[PDB]
Amino acid sequence: AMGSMERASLIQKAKLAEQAERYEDMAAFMKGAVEKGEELSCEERNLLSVAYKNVVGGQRAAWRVLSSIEQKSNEKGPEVREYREKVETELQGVCDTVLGLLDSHLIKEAGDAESRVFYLKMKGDYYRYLAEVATGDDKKRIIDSARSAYQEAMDISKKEMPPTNPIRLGLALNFSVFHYEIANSPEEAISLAKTTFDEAMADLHTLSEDSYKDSTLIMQLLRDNLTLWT
C-alpha cells in the first residue's frame, strides 16, 4: 500500500483528492508517491505539504477543543482525558509518519536549496506540532529537534535564496511562530518577523507581478503576527 499503484497515478489521485477536499486520501496517495523512492518535484512537494498540513490541522483543531474542555473539568470521569489522548495519539502518529518520510529518505537525497530547505522546514513544523501536545522532558528534546531543523533550514535559506523566496518567507514565518508559541521567546519571534519582513520589502523591486503577489501574501502574515504580538 500503495505499492501496486503507479507513481504518476498516485500524483494524479492526490490532485483529485485535493479537489474533493479528501485530505486523508491525499496524504496517503502522497505517502505512496514518496515511498516509490524517486525525489519529488516542486509541485509534488507542495502536494505532500498541503495533504499533511490539512490532516494534522484538523487533528490540532480537535485536540485544542478537547484540551480546553479537559482543562475546565480541572477547575467527573475519565472520558474527556481518554478521548483527548486518543486524538493526541492519532496526531502524534501522523507527525511521526511525516517525520519518517523526511528521514527515509527525502532530506538525504535533497541537494538543491529549494528542496532541502522545504524538507528541513517540514521537519521543524512536524516537531513543532509534536511539541504543542508534549509535556516532557520529552517536551524539551522535541522542542530542540524543531529548533535544530528550523535553524539548518534558515542557514541554507539565507545563503541560497533571495529574501523574497516564498519558501524562505514561510520558513521564517513558521520559525517565528515556533519562538512565540513553543519556545517562550516572544522577543526572538518579533525580531525574526520584523527582520524577515524588512529584508523582503527591500527585495520586492526585483520581482515580477506574480512573484510579488506570492511574496507579499506571506509578508502580510508576518505583519499580522507582529500586530498581534505588539
Partner: peptide, 8 residues
Amino acid sequence: RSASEPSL
C-alpha cells in the same frame, strides 16, 4: 493564536 504558513 499566531498565523503560520497557509495551505496554498
